[PDB]
Design a protein around this ligand. Structure first.
Ligand SMILES: Cc1cn([C@@H]2O[C@H](CO)[C@@H](O)[C@H]2O)c(=O)[nH]c1=O
Length: 130
């Protein structure tokens, strides 16, 4: 449907806007790009599904997200990866875990305030019909 395509285009605009606001926050810099393999060579072995905000933008533009739920699974992945890969009591690990939790919480709070539930419901229904 042309009307369904308008729905998804609006979803994409909304997701780019949320992702931009996360990406510009200084606390979340570490999550804006894939990690440096030369810097952290065991990362690809420990973390099988790397995710970051640049990859999220790429996925939005590739029409990979048809719902906000599918977007949040990738935000959740950014966060869970950070908790799994940096689990220690040392301050560097604690800092990154705090920042990961904050990224997750911030994304969910923006969505809570700014996503219309009926718009998400529409997206989910279109997705489930395909
Ligand atoms: C996302 C992430 C990053 N880092 C460090 O910050 C650099 C830039 O991402 C990485 O190369 C790594 O040294 C980590 O140590 N753990 C992580 O989970």
């Amino acid at each position: 449907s042309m009307q369904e395509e308008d729905t998804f285009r609006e979803l994409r605009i909304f997701l780019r806007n949320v992702t931009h606001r996360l990406a510009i926050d200084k606390r979340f810099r570490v999550f804006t790009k894939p990690v440096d393999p030369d810097e952290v060579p065991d990362y690809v072995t420990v973390i099988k599904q790397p995710m970051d905000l640049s990859s999220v933008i790429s996925k939005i533009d590739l029409h990979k997200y048809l719902t906000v739920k599918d977007y949040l699974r990738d935000i959740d992945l950014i966060c869970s990866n950070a908790l799994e890969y940096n689990p220690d009591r040392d301050p560097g690990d604690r800092l990154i875990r705090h920042r990961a939790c904050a990224l997750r919480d911030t994304a969910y709070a923006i969505i809570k305030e700014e996503l219309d539930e009926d718009f998400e419901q529409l997206c989910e229904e279109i997705q489930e019909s395909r």
